[PDB]
Every structure is written in C-alpha cells, then in structure tokens.
Enzyme design. Sequence first.
Site, PDB file in Angstrom:
ATOM      1  N   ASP A 232      -1.727  -3.659   1.447  1.00  0.00           N
ATOM      2  CA  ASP A 232      -2.586  -4.167   2.512  1.00  0.00           C
ATOM      3  C   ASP A 232      -2.916  -5.618   2.203  1.00  0.00           C
ATOM      4  O   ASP A 232      -2.654  -6.101   1.108  1.00  0.00           O
ATOM      5  CB  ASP A 232      -3.902  -3.396   2.558  1.00  0.00           C
ATOM      6  CG  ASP A 232      -3.803  -2.097   3.322  1.00  0.00           C
ATOM      7  OD1 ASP A 232      -4.829  -1.382   3.381  1.00  0.00           O
ATOM      8  OD2 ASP A 232      -2.717  -1.801   3.865  1.00  0.00           O
ATOM      9  N   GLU A 503      -8.635   4.923  12.794  1.00  0.00           N
ATOM     10  CA  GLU A 503      -7.524   4.443  13.600  1.00  0.00           C
ATOM     11  C   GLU A 503      -7.363   5.360  14.797  1.00  0.00           C
ATOM     12  O   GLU A 503      -7.169   6.572  14.635  1.00  0.00           O
ATOM     13  CB  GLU A 503      -6.240   4.393  12.770  1.00  0.00           C
ATOM     14  CG  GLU A 503      -6.332   3.467  11.568  1.00  0.00           C
ATOM     15  CD  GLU A 503      -5.408   3.880  10.436  1.00  0.00           C
ATOM     16  OE1 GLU A 503      -5.085   5.084  10.326  1.00  0.00           O
ATOM     17  OE2 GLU A 503      -5.002   2.996   9.655  1.00  0.00           O
ATOM     18  N   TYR A 615       2.440   6.337   8.933  1.00  0.00           N
ATOM     19  CA  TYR A 615       2.063   5.723  10.206  1.00  0.00           C
ATOM     20  C   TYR A 615       3.237   5.850  11.156  1.00  0.00           C
ATOM     21  O   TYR A 615       4.388   5.873  10.717  1.00  0.00           O
ATOM     22  CB  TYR A 615       1.651   4.266  10.022  1.00  0.00           C
ATOM     23  CG  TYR A 615       0.237   4.110   9.502  1.00  0.00           C
ATOM     24  CD1 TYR A 615      -0.261   4.951   8.507  1.00  0.00           C
ATOM     25  CD2 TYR A 615      -0.598   3.133  10.003  1.00  0.00           C
ATOM     26  CE1 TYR A 615      -1.553   4.821   8.034  1.00  0.00           C
ATOM     27  CE2 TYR A 615      -1.889   2.991   9.534  1.00  0.00           C
ATOM     28  CZ  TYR A 615      -2.360   3.831   8.544  1.00  0.00           C
ATOM     29  OH  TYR A 615      -3.646   3.686   8.074  1.00  0.00           O
TER      30      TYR A 615
HETATM   31  O1  LIG Z   1      -4.386   4.139   4.743  1.00  0.00           O
HETATM   32  S1  LIG Z   1      -3.664   2.871   4.575  1.00  0.00           S
HETATM   33  O2  LIG Z   1      -2.800   2.633   5.739  1.00  0.00           O
HETATM   34  O3  LIG Z   1      -2.828   2.882   3.373  1.00  0.00           O
HETATM   35  C1  LIG Z   1      -4.834   1.559   4.517  1.00  0.00           C
HETATM   36  C2  LIG Z   1      -4.938   0.706   5.734  1.00  0.00           C
HETATM   37  N1  LIG Z   1      -6.054  -0.186   5.759  1.00  0.00           N
HETATM   38  C3  LIG Z   1      -6.266  -0.685   7.087  1.00  0.00           C
HETATM   39  C4  LIG Z   1      -6.669  -2.117   7.174  1.00  0.00           C
HETATM   40  C5  LIG Z   1      -7.135  -2.783   8.311  1.00  0.00           C
HETATM   41  C6  LIG Z   1      -7.378  -4.139   7.892  1.00  0.00           C
HETATM   42  C7  LIG Z   1      -7.035  -4.167   6.540  1.00  0.00           C
HETATM   43  O4  LIG Z   1      -6.632  -2.969   6.180  1.00  0.00           O
END
Ligand SMILES: O=S(=O)(O)CCNCc1ccco1
Length: 658
Positions: A232, A503, A615
């Site tokens: 990330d 999300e 995803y």
């Molecule tokens: O569960 S994961 O997809 O590994 C983590 C995702 N994090 C989301 C995000 C949004 C803005 C910075 O990071």
Amino acid sequence: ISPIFQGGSYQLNNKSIDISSLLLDKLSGESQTVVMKFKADKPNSLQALFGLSNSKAGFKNNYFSIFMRDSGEIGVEIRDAQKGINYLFSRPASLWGKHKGQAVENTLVFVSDSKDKTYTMYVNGIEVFSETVDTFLPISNINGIDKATLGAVNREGKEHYLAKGSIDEISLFNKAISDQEVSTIPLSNPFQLIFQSGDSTQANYFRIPTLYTLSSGRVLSSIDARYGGTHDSKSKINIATSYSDDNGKTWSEPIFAMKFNDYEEQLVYWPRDNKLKNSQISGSASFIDSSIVEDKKSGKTILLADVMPAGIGNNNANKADSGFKEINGHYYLKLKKNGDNDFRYTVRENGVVYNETTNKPTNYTINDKYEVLEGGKSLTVEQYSVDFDSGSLRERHNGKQVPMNVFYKDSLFKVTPTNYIAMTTSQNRGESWEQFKLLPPFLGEKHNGTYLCPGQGLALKSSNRLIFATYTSGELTYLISDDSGQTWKKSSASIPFKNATAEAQMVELRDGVIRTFFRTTTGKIAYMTSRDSGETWSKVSYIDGIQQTSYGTQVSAIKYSQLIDGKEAVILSTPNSRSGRKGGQLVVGLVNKEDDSIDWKYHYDIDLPSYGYAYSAITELPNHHIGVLFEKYDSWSRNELHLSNVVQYIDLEINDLT
Ligand SMILES: O=S(=O)(O)CCNCc1ccco1
C-alpha cells in the site's frame, strides 16, 4: 532443438511412475530444460510432480524435485549432501486448478542453466522466479542419482510427496532454452493479462483492479500500477488504464490516468526474504484505489483515486486535518514553505499563493497540475530512483529535473501530510485523461479526507446522478453529483464499526433503489439500502452464505441486465473463506420484487477453494458475458507479497455460473 525425452498421458493417483529406464541415460551436460503440461485440481497439501533422486539408503537428501502446494505455489528443490548444497526456490500463487468446471492444463517450464548459473521457472507463460547461485548444481550432477520419478520423489526406496493429478505431456532437453524459445511454447491459458510486468507502465506489480462497460461497447479498466512491490501507500503508485473494443479479447497498451513524476517509473524485482520484504518506498507521492463511471449526459468518463503526498499512506496520514483552511464558505488548499514549521499559505483563486499571516499574496503560483511557479517561471525538483545495490533499499537523486509539485518531497511548498481524493475525466473513453483535480473536504476542515471505494461508481439509470462510495471511521460517505461531476455533495450513512476498511460497491435494483454491499470486520458481507437515490440510508444487514476473514476483502457487484430464472439478478464477486483471501466466487442473486430481498441461488467456483482470490472487478460485457479481473493471490498474506502478473482477467458466461 530436440527433446532427449518425451512422454505423455501420465495419471498421478497417489502412486508414482518410474521413468528411469527411459530418461536417466539421456541426461548429459550441465544445462537442462524440463517442459511439463500438467493438471491438478485435487492435489494434496504438498506433492512432487517430478523427481530425480538417489534412492539409495544414506542419501535421502540427494535429489531434484518439482513440487507444488495446494495453495497454488510451485517450486523446485536441488539437494546434494556430499556437495553441501541445498537449494529451494519457489513462488506462491503460481498455478491454476479449475476453470469453468474442467481442470486447467498448466504449462510449466523449468530452465537449469550452467552458464549464467541460473534457475528459472515459467508457469502458463509467466516467469515466476529466476535465481542465480554462486555455486551451480546441475540437476544431473547430483551425487548417485538412480531414479526418475513422476508423482513422487523416490527417497530411500519409498514414495515421498505422493501426488494427485496428471501430466498430459513432459519433454526434457539437454540444453537451457532461451527466452525467445520459451515464448514459442503453446499455452492452454484460461486467462489473459490486461496489465503485466514490462508493459508501458513499467510497474512490476499491480493491485486493485476495476472494470466498466461504456456506452460504446468499449470496456475500460483502471488499476494501481505499483512500483515498490505490492505495498500500500506509502510507495510509488500510478493509476493506469487500458480498454477493450472487442469484448475483452484484446486490450490496449495501458496509459496513465493519474501519475506523479518525483520518482522514476522503475520495473524493480522486490526482495521476498523476511529480512527485506518490508522495504518500502518512502519518499514518493502516490495514487491508490481508483473508481470509474460513465456519465450519460456529458458522455465523459470519470475516474477518482486517493492521493497521497510524498511519504504518506493511510497508517500515518494526518487524520484531524482535511488539508484545507476554510475562509468564508470556501475551502482553500494549505501549503508549508521550507523553514516554516507551520502552514502559513493557501492556494487562492487563480492558484495564487497567499500568505495567511502577513495577508499579502506572494510571487508564487500553483498551476493546474499542482506544479509550483515563481514569478510565472516553472520550478523543478530532481528525480529519485530506488535500488538495492547496497544490499538494502536506497532512494537517491538520479539527475533528471521534473516540475516541482506540492505533493513532492523536495517541493518548496508542501500540502498537508494527509489523504486526498482527486478526479480526472476522459472525453475520449480512455484514450487520454485530463489533469486531475482535487476534491474539496466533505467531513469538515479538521477531518482527514475519506477513502475512495475501489471499483465502480454508480450511474443511476433514470437521472444524471453520479454516486461514488467512500468510507471513513464509522460511516460510508457517499459522494453525489447531479452535474456531470462539476460539483459534489456528501450523504452519510452510519455503520456499526470503527476503523473498518468498509470498501463498498452499489447496485441499482430498480429506479432510485440502491443496494450497497461493503466489507466489514465481522467475517460477513454487509449491506444497506437507499430508496431515494442515495439521499438517505437503511440500517446495516448481513449476508449469510458467504464468509470472509475477520479483516475481510473488497467485494464487487453488478446488476445483471438479463433475467435469470425469470427474475432480476444481481451478481457478486468475493473470496468465500474465513482462512484467507482464497476460494473466489461469483454469487448469483435473484431479487424479490415484493420486498427487494435477494435469494442467492448460485455460487460459481472461480478456481479451487484453496487458491488465492482477493480484490476483484466484474462487468457485463457488451455480449452479455461477464468480464472478471481479479487478484489471483492472497493480497493479505505476508507470504504472498510482491508477485508479478497475479492480477488476471477471464471471460465467463451466465450458464457457466448456473
Ligand atoms: O486489505 S488491503 O487491501 O491489503 C489494504 C488496503 N488499504 C486501503 C487503503 C486506502 C488508502 C490507503 O490504503
């Protein structure tokens, strides 16, 4: 050249096959190439497909194997007790099991090359590892080899790592074949790559796919082009896009929707050893989580993403600061000049940099690309590159000069170290993208920006209303525009969580009725319902019949256009597992017009329950097939970081699901 050995149609039923009499005398020289077309849809936790061993007592560690785990991982072993050599090379998430019901034929190519001293593996056309040693061990110079085995490794006269599957075809070569030759091996791939290592993005890694069918029949996709491994933000990440005009059979060479220039675009192989895999690019600004929609009215295509200033991600983003100062009804973007320890500037009308303390405007202005100008002259910073030549990660000025941007580390004027949301538009359906504009604060001057839900925004079928779902602590904050994205209003729907990564993705069940499905912290998928076109929202409910992990995973959803068993139908894409991000599924739900409830009637197994699925993006393709672009790996698992070409695309038909 020619295969020194070739066999085919081997059945691996937890009994191994001996091919010594055929292969062992053929083997010669120090370079070899195995080529193996095999199927395994019901494998054991750990099984050997191929083996060269010394089956004699006293030499249990003298062997070569090609093995797989039921996680989808593939590997080789090269072991010689006398030589003191024990090599194990592998990669997670390298295999397919099933597609559309039938078992997938994987195309494995292992190269053993004594000139570069290098072990390279390709599976289904993708290079999954390439390792150089200082002390090379030819797979055939292993001390006292006396067996050649399929479906096991013959150690001390017993069948170890018994296998379950088939090898339709196996070829052996006393040469190490070249890349060019490798590429000419036919494949039986159930998938395709839209974005891939070495393409125009120069990003070695991709995450967070999106899909949207446009009114022209063109299918568009947006994604995180991630450079510093699959981390990330903070990192370097760009937003890339590509389209298909032939229902996803081919895809355009990707272009950038949103990009920064402070760090170079570098195709880097990121370290996977425990000592180094958490190396993370720490001076780069970045984009992350994109969402797309088409607006009927303008014909425009709209893309949003989260924006992160240099060195910023969500874990260290300044919450309790939107990044704007409010001056009489208006939000202005704040700036900090070097030497100051407070923010004393704003970007007023016509990008004028105004000093807040003195109340005098300054000789500096901010252009549309958020680049800094002094007295009308464009200022520049030097670019950074990353490398691991010193044995650890190192970011350093590479000589090149680039426009100074207030999101950059070296900028003379800097934004608030927090998360922003930006939009861009395309007048030409993905062929080019405008310079992105930052969106204003929605939850106040002293509250960090929310987080864009990756995937699709929703275009209501009976108005010009555009909705993009975002999330923050304790609520979904939907963003609404009725004017083709020129202006935006928030609509808050409380949820019963704090600090959840909620999300969210929306479907319209009928005119003005929006169902949103979002990720929770419960192990179940939640949902809520608006009935006034996203003005107000129901209470949160949950779906039973799908499980996620405690930390959950992104869920994509679409309202199908054709009826299914006479009913309106909604399709859902998600991992169905409580262990991790695997067991991907497409779940079909029929709507009950009486109450707007959903009967989830069909579950489609994308692949094995044990193979990675994270995803995802689904879309109705113009021919009513379903396009699916997904992370074919566990994007949560610390063991599955930094894989190339694991985001994959497939074509399904409705009947495939039912
Ligand atoms: O569960 S994961 O997809 O590994 C983590 C995702 N994090 C989301 C995000 C949004 C803005 C910075 O990071």
